[PDB]
Design a protein around this ligand. Structure first.
Ligand SMILES: Nc1ncnc2c1ncn2[C@@H]1O[C@H](COP(=O)(O)OP(=O)(O)NP(=O)(O)O)[C@@H](O)[C@H]1O
Ligand SMILES: Nc1ncnc2c1ncn2[C@@H]1O[C@H](COP(=O)(O)OP(=O)(O)O)[C@@H](O)[C@H]1O
Ligand SMILES: [Mg+2]
Ligand SMILES: [Mg+2]
Lengths: 269, 293
């Protein structure tokens, strides 16, 4: 709810954790004003490609990102303006959901898979009710807070830069149009990642025109552990017409109904 | 932590919904047209696999509402879930601006058209076998606990003169182990309770079955023609039913009368119907008088 602002002297970068499309994530530390304490944090550095030198001051979008907190999203502890933007969050040691489902695979409970679907839909619903568009939802951007809790990360980051192809909706690919419904598409692909235990969307294919194929009528194939009931949801998430796609609350509710009877909707042996 | 175990047991539906692209199948000509969309005839050419599959391509006008779409999707769900020699199964869908259901083509198409065009080449032993196969298919649908809320000659396809199947499923609804009724449409094919109380059951599809068999024995005549759907209710209230077809014996028309009984439990079951019509099928000239035979 409240956006905290840091000074460049309060932050320090220890080791590079990894880089993606937008920024570079460092595992670093917080040393507040006047103290000698080192509190382990996660500092993501986004380079200012504005040209107007816009990350030297705290913008409205930064405040929008920093004024969000939910049980199933990654709370932004603080931001640090300047030549480079530094986004500070908690350091979740358990890692991403992608690496986790790739690691344990079938060993994880179907109840946990369904409930994780519910949680992701929860976080996205919270983000949508506050007008926040994610623009980069994926299994890689879902981190484990607890062995039973997952949180959505890297939201609002995309529109910090001036104007991921396999998680984007068609309108986003063609016209750079980003909506909560595009986040619904991305949600469907994320759940596909989840229940296929970390499979790569459109593996054999190349990016050059994944969009062509999506327009030709092809989608991600039905997951081997997925009943027709669960796959139908992903299918509706991948609809071309924008308000044919499900809303995040409907998604959360139906994954809840499925969470009421896990073995009836997921078959793992 | 995590939200309630609340188990119902019961088997998971692991029907496979294969997704096809528009460039994998061709459109040749139109088989049907209307406000629903358009049913096409065409050739399906699979990916890497090359047998050429004559298919029907039911493509529907894009969805008005968020689930205006998914009754189409429920139709696809059902057509993907069923598996029976006497029920037409989904081969896959094409998801684009307009959803396209793909089924195997039936060369002779609609049965209602067939019993009309071939009016005086159809014998005893074909009509009775058709009734048998329809009873079997509907009995399978009863075993899967789904009700075919739109059974008629219009929704029966012909693979060969010796083999028919069931389709549509646009109004079909799945009953849970919970439910025994479905409470929510062609008036002249529905049971009385479906008209008065909007109650749909497996015994409602028995009424519809009776009307279907009536359409077959009358060689494609229209039910209650001249009578507006407007309160056909009342005529049934009087106890007046469909007339006896000229080729039907008093025993066949007894089964027809049996399907149109007010008491739903007094009506026959699909199993019973299979037994009876299979019995009749072993001596068809005795139960149907046709001078062509
Ligand atoms: N709070 C966090 N705790 C631990 N690791 C994190 C945290 N946030 C991000 N990471 C890691 O940072 C690494 C790379 O960061 P980043 O490049 O921003 O995300 P990404 O995996 O590349 N997905 P994206 O950049 O949105 O396409 C990933 O391996 C994440 O596991
Ligand atoms: N597989 C098929 N083979 C031949 N004809 C078909 C096939 N599927 C549909 N048709 C044609 O379409 C009609 C049935 O379509 P149906 O599934 O009942 O859709 P609706 O009732 O919603 O229009 C029949 O008259 C038939 O001629
Ligand atoms: Mg990330
Ligand atoms: Mg029809």
């Amino acid at each position: 709810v409240l956006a905290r602002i840091f000074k460049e002297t309060e932050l320090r970068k220890l080791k590079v954790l990894g880089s993606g499309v937008f920024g570079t994530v460092h595992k670093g530390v917080w040393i507040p004003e006047g103290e000698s304490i080192k509190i382990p944090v996660c500092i993501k550095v986004i380079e200012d490609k504005s040209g107007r030198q816009s990350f030297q001051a705290v913008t409205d979008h930064m405040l929008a990102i920093g004024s969000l907190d939910h049980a199933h999203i990654v709370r932004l502890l603080g931001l640090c303006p300047g030549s480079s933007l530094q986004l500070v969050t908690q350091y979740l040691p358990l890692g991403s959901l992608l690496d986790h489902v790739r690691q344990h695979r079938g060993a994880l409970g179907p109840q946990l898979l369904l409930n994780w679907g519910v949680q992701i839909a929860k976080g996205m619903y919270y983000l949508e009710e506050h007008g926040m568009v994610h623009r980069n939802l994926a299994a890689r951007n879902v981190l484990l807070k607890s062995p039973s809790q997952v949180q959505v990360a890297d939201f609002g980051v995309a529109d910090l830069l001036p104007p991921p192809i396999k998680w984007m909706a068609l309108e986003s690919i063609h016209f750079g149009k980003y909506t909560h419904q595009s986040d619904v598409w991305s949600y469907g692909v994320t759940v596909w990642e989840l229940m296929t235990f970390g499979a790569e969307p459109y593996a054999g294919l190349r990016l050059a025109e994944v969009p062509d194929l999506l327009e030709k009528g092809e989608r991600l194939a039905q997951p081997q552990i997925c009943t027709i009931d669960v796959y139908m949801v992903m299918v509706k998430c991948w609809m071309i017409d924008e308000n044919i796609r499900p809303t995040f609350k409907e998604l959360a509710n139906e994954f809840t109904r499925m969470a009421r009877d896990p073995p009836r909707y997921l078959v793992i042996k | 932590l995590v939200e309630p175990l609340t188990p119902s047991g019961e088997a998971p539906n692991q029907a496979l919904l294969r997704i096809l692209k528009e460039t994998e199948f061709k459109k040749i000509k139109v088989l049907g047209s209307g406000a629903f969309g358009t049913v096409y005839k065409g050739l399906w050419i699979p990916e890497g696999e090359k047998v050429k599959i004559p298919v029907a391509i039911k493509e529907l006008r894009e969805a008005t509402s968020p689930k205006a779409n998914k009754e189409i999707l429920d139709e696809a769900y059902v057509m993907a879930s069923v598996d029976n020699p006497h029920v037409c199964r989904l081969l896959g869908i094409c998801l684009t601006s307009t959803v396209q259901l793909i089924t195997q083509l039936m060369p002779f198409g609609c049965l209602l058209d067939y019993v009309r065009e071939h009016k005086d080449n159809i014998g005893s032993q074909y009509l009775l076998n058709w009734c048998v196969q329809i009873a079997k298919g509907m009995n399978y649908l009863e075993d899967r606990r789904l009700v075919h809320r739109d059974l008629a000659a219009r929704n029966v396809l012909v693979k060969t003169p010796q083999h028919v199947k069931i389709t549509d499923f646009g109004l079909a609804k799945l009953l849970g182990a919970e439910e025994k009724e479905y409470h929510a449409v062609p008036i002249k094919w529905m049971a009385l309770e479906s008209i008065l109380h909007r109650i749909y059951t497996h015994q409602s599809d028995v009424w519809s079955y009776g009307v279907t068999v009536w359409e077959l024995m009358t060689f494609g005549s229209k039910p209650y023609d001249g009578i507006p759907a407007s309160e056909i209710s009342s005529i049934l209230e009087k106890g007046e039913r469909l007339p006896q077809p000229p080729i039907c014996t008093i025993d066949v028309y007894m089964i027809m009368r049996k399907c149109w009984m007010i008491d739903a439990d007094s009506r026959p079951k699909f199993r019973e119907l299979i037994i009876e019509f299979s019995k009749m099928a072993r001596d068809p000239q005795r139960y149907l008088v046709i001078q062509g035979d």
